[PDB]
């Protein structure tokens, strides 16, 4: 699938540091340690199970406002 | 806490101007200059001491029909 573009859904960012001034954002929060992290695919990219990112590839070091701590 | 969406309570808008249609609205009126404002908790977002806004965060440039001027 095509790689996700900043702002895709929920304020998505390919560079979590970029989500900085977001009230919900916390240091340490990445698509990688997210409860929506499907599996890795190619060169930092992976799949997000959250229904909203079903047709794009997302980035390991990225972030979105729908972020939940992995269990 | 979570950010407050538009219409949360008392005609709430995260962007003051949007309320230009309210009888109680006046240019220059903002959460940050409101008596119920409990200051920025996060960057551009603060607390509201009004019980109807107690679970959420409100926005410095927002406005609610229960606005009260402050010093
Ligand atoms: S839900 Fe989690 S994994 Fe999916 S894009 Fe947002 S932060 Fe990344
Ligand atoms: S009462 Fe309304 S205008 Fe005043 S701070 Fe709370 S949300 Fe903003």
Q: What this model shows, in words?
A:
The structure is a homodimer of 71-residue chains. The first copy, chain A, has 71 residues and is an all-beta fold. The first copy, chain A, has one domain: High-Potential Iron-Sulfur Protein, Chain A (Irregular), CATH 4.10.490.10. The first copy, chain A, is built from no helices and three strands. Chain A has a three-stranded antiparallel beta sheet with strand order 1-2-3, with no helix packed on it. The first copy, chain A, is globular, with a radius of gyration of 11 Å. One iron/sulfur cluster binds next to loops of chain A.
CATH fold assignment of chain A? High-Potential Iron-Sulfur Protein, Chain A
Strand order of the largest sheet of chain A: 1-2-3
Amount of beta strand of chain A: 5-15%
Please estimate the helix content of chain A.
Answer: under 10%
CATH superfamily placement of chain A: High potential iron-sulphur protein
Please report the distance between the alpha carbons of the first and last residues of chain A. Answer: 27 Å
Structural class estimated from helices and strands of chain A: mainly beta
Show the largest interface.
Answer: A-B, 3 and 7 residues
Biased composition (Basic and acidic residues) (chains A, B): 1-13
Organism (chains A, B): Halorhodospira halophila
Keywords (chains A, B): 4Fe-4S, Electron transport, Iron, Iron-sulfur, Metal-binding, Transport
Binding site for [4Fe-4S] cluster (chains A, B): 31, 34, 48, 64
């Amino acid at each position: 699938e095509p790689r996700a573009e900043d702002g895709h859904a929920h304020d998505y960012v390919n560079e979590a540091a970029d989500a900085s001034g977001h009230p919900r954002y916390q240091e340490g929060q990445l698509c990688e340690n997210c409860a929506f992290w499907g599996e890795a695919v190619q060169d930092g990219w992976g799949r997000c199970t959250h229904p909203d990112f079903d047709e794009v590839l997302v980035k390991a070091e990225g972030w979105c406002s729908v972020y939940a701590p992995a269990s």
